Structure formats: structure tokens, C-alpha cells
């Protein structure tokens, strides 16, 4: 699981 941002 990879999440980037805000």
C-alpha cells in the first residue's frame, strides 16, 4: 500500500 498526498 502506497499513499502520497494530503
Swiss-Prot record:
Location(s), subcellular: Nucleus; Cytoplasm, Cytosol
Distribution of this protein across tissues and organs: Expressed in leaf sheaths and leaf blades. Expressed at low levels in roots, flowers and seeds.
Induction section of the entry: Repressed by abscisic acid (ABA) and drought stress.
Oligomeric form and interacting partners: Monomer. Interacts with PP2C30. Binding to PP2C30 is dependent on the presence of abscisic acid (ABA). Interacts with PP2C51. Binding to PP2C51 is dependent on the presence of ABA. Interacts with PP2C50. Binding to PP2C50 is dependent on the presence of ABA. Interacts with PP2C53.
Additional detail: Plants overexpressing PYL5 exhibit abscisic acid (ABA) hypersensitive phenotypes. Plants overexpressing PYL5 exhibit tolerance to salt and drought stresses, but are hypersensitive to osmotic stress and ABA during vegetative growth.
Stated role: Intracellular abscisic acid (ABA) receptor that functions as a positive regulator of ABA signaling pathway. Together with ABI5, PP2C30 and SAPK2, is part of an ABA signaling unit that modulates seed germination and early seedling growth. Acts as a positive regulator of abiotic stress-responsive gene expression. Inhibits the protein phosphatases PP2C06 and PP2C09 when activated by ABA.
Annotated family: Belongs to the PYR/PYL/RCAR abscisic acid intracellular receptor family.
Protein name, per record: Abscisic acid receptor PYL5
Gene it is expressed from: PYL5
